[PDB]
Amino acid sequence: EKIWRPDLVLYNNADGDFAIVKFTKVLLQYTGHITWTPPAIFKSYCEIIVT
Amino acid sequence: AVEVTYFPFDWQNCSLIFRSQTYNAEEVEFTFAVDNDGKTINKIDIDTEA
Ligand SMILES: *[C@@H]1O[C@H](CO)[C@@H](O[C@@H]2O[C@H](CO)[C@@H](O[C@@H]3O[C@H](CO[C@H]4O[C@H](CO)[C@@H](O)[C@H](O)[C@@H]4O)[C@@H](O)[C@H](O[C@H]4O[C@H](CO)[C@@H](O)[C@H](O)[C@@H]4O)[C@@H]3O)[C@H](O)[C@H]2NC(C)=O)[C@H](O)[C@H]1NC(C)=O
């Protein structure tokens, strides 16, 4: 929460969360490199063919 | 995951996996707690009071 982040969104979200809600800590290296690996539960629309 | 083959006369193997969400093994490590006798409690503890 303390740093700028990309605002990644699941565009084809069905009825769950659109973006990351679990704001876990980021690993910051001395070179300025940041790795952020949040968990999520994605509920995504998928056209189901039942033929 | 439920092994259904002998349901309802079945036995299961359920895992409980604990880890640090933030730190790698070099930064934070784990050891099992020892009992009053100094024996390592490498199992789920069961207190008869609770
Ligand atoms: C309930 O569920 C748990 C978890 O699933 C089971 O415990 C696991 O059981 C499996 C075997 O079924 C164990 O896997 C075996 O581990 C052996 C030891 O190597 C491990 O540990 C060393 C530690 O230094 C590591 O370096 C290594 O990478 C491994 O993690 C291996 O020798 C075994 O190898 C065999 O299988 C592999 C394929 O998986 C083959 O490639 C090999 O040639 C060989 O045939 C195997 O990998 C696993 O470690 C257990 N996890 C634990 C104990 O935490 C319980 O057994 C299960 N209880 C039941 C069913 O009663």
Side-chain angles (χ1 to χ4, degrees):
Chain A
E1 301 96 335
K2 256 173 90 203
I3 57 162
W4 177 97
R5 309 178 304 288
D7 61 327
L8 288 182
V9 161
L10 185 71
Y11 278 48
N12 63 315
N13 169 40
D15 59 356
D17 294 303
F18 285 95
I20 296 298
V21 296
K22 305 289 194 57
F23 290 96
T24 58
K25 286 191 180 173
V26 316
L27 172 61
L28 169 64
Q29 315 276 2
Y30 72 99
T31 59
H33 189 268
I34 293 165
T35 310
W36 180 42
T37 317
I41 291 182
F42 281 1
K43 280 160 171 322
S44 68
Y45 179 91
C46 170
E47 184 189 59
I48 301 294
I49 316 302
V50 299
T51 310
Chain B
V2 172
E3 213 288 291
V4 313
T5 305
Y6 303 100
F7 173 87
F9 309 93
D10 57 300
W11 69 269
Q12 298 304 318
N13 179 0
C14 292
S15 295
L16 288 181
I17 306 167
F18 292 96
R19 66 185 270 287
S20 174
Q21 218 184 16
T22 308
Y23 301 111
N24 60 47
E26 289 84 354
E27 291 171 300
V28 168
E29 66 177 357
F30 295 115
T31 60
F32 282 124
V34 302
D35 65 356
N36 283 4
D37 318 300
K39 183 178 179 180
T40 302
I41 305 162
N42 51 359
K43 65 188 291 293
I44 292 283
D45 192 53
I46 303 292
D47 190 358
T48 68
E49 289 282 3

